[PDB]
Design an enzyme around this catalytic site. Sequence first.
Site, short mmCIF file in Angstrom:
data_model
loop_
_atom_site.label_atom_id
_atom_site.label_comp_id
_atom_site.label_asym_id
_atom_site.label_seq_id
_atom_site.Cartn_x
_atom_site.Cartn_y
_atom_site.Cartn_z
NE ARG A 1 -7.77 -8.21 0.24
CZ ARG A 1 -7.40 -7.31 -0.66
NH1 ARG A 1 -6.47 -6.40 -0.36
NH2 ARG A 1 -7.94 -7.33 -1.88
CE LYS B 1 -4.52 -1.52 1.41
NZ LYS B 1 -5.36 -1.96 2.56
N1 LIG Z 1 -10.58 -6.65 4.11
C1 LIG Z 1 -9.93 -5.91 3.17
N2 LIG Z 1 -10.41 -5.90 1.89
C2 LIG Z 1 -9.80 -5.18 0.92
N3 LIG Z 1 -10.32 -5.18 -0.34
C3 LIG Z 1 -8.57 -4.39 1.26
N4 LIG Z 1 -7.92 -3.65 0.31
O1 LIG Z 1 -6.90 -3.02 0.56
O2 LIG Z 1 -8.35 -3.62 -0.85
C4 LIG Z 1 -8.12 -4.46 2.68
O3 LIG Z 1 -7.10 -3.87 3.09
N5 LIG Z 1 -8.82 -5.23 3.54
#
Ligand SMILES: Nc1nc(N)c([N+](=O)[O-])c(=O)[nH]1
Lengths: 261, 261
Positions: B241, B207
């Site tokens: 994730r 990120k």
């Molecule tokens: N739970 C969760 N879903 C996502 N799509 C993201 N994301 O960055 O796209 C996240 O950080 N957490």
Amino acid sequence: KWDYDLRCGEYTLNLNEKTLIMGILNVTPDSFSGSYNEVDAAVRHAKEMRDEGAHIIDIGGSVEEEIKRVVPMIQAVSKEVKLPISIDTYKAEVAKQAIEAGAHIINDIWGAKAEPKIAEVAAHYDVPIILMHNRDNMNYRNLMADMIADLYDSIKIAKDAGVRDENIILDPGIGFAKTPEQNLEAMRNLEQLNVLGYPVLLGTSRKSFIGHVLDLPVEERLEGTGATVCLGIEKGCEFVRVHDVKEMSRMAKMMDAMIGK
Amino acid sequence: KWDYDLRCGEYTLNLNEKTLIMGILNVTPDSFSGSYNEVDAAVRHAKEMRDEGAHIIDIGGSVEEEIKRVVPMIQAVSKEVKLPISIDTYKAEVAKQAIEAGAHIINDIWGAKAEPKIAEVAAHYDVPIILMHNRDNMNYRNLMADMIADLYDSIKIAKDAGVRDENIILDPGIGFAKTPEQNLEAMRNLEQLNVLGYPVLLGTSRKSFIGHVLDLPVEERLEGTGATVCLGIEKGCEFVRVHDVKEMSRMAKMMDAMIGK
Ligand SMILES: Nc1nc(N)c([N+](=O)[O-])c(=O)[nH]1
Ligand SMILES: Nc1nc(N)c([N+](=O)[O-])c(=O)[nH]1
């Protein structure tokens, strides 16, 4: 948080700004011999580590022969790479020669216990000395309590020899005199070393206990080393001693930003 | 520590054994179109992630067109890769179709707030739902306090719709509705989410705020992502994730061993 700077002659290391990265110089010796191939590959490695974020270069070593190998490398790196050099020895005579050759910090894996006179060398040249936890056995009553005890016995040897508190760094001696489970226990409880009042250096790079968890050869331990570096910084260590300087500098740098260092 | 298992129809995720790795499926669509090139590259990616330690596959998506793209991929991955699938949607109709197609977990980036009926979909199919912190603004009085407040407003929408506590996972929404400094503050204070009583998923992979600290492009954020994963596990998260499944599994695995999970 630290009310003083780590003073290293020409260089000064601030202990608050960031986790300081200690690069492990590979010291592959020539079979034929301070020869050109071995000192040049050392300088080149030290230069590379300097380029990828190392703050200190750690240089390791028959006692007379140990000096003949390490002295030339300290001379060449000291000149060619503007960074503090720690000498990785537990021998007093080796430490003397190395600071004489240009080393800034003593890195003792036996915390002044194998050769007490090393603290005396530290006291005179007035250099920071790293006292690492180590023992000739694993008969722990209580791992952390024994560790902190054994570390204090180093601080006392150091202090008794003339070493100022400000030149004392502690190291939990991960991968020394400890089972793999005890190494994990020491990592789990690293913050306890903070009560002693001294900067802590963590040395976990590529070590056997990472391979024991991950079931991976030494060249596949970069992620496992990263975890230990990360937990270590979160638990308060001022330094990490690493082979993978580029990666571990980036990881240290991100930990710092997050933890507020 | 967790007195229950995360139940996902055919699969069951134990929350105590280890940090569970959620693999981010790249869903590069065909320009021409459930076409063979896009579903096959998806299956292949999911297979690779399964091979390198992922515990869940996260699959993301005009609402009718969103379903046409994600449904076939869930069908193909569900069949070919024996792992729980989370659907990455905030839309209720998209979530309905996806569980119908074989998805096991709902992953809502708007924590039941963009489309409340999603919690109702969650409640009926009785699937775990991830409620992520997010807001259409950054006007924080107090970042962490507001976060925990905003998260509770999700839990209430979920609970009011019929969602059992045991199907609720929380996510601090790192990189959403937060400045880079606020992202670091949330990382610094992640353990506070634990008072809410629910499993936490951390999503920090590659990120922008990692790049903001390290000054590095998205493809150079693996070490920075590792730091966040490490701090996250140390602060109690049950899931991470990640894009880099191989690396982050090895890192998660080492954190686990150290922290005693
Ligand atoms: N739970 C969760 N879903 C996502 N799509 C993201 N994301 O960055 O796209 C996240 O950080 N957490
Ligand atoms: N301070 C310190 N010195 C070392 N030589 C090591 N080592 O593993 O070799 C260490 O971990 N710490």
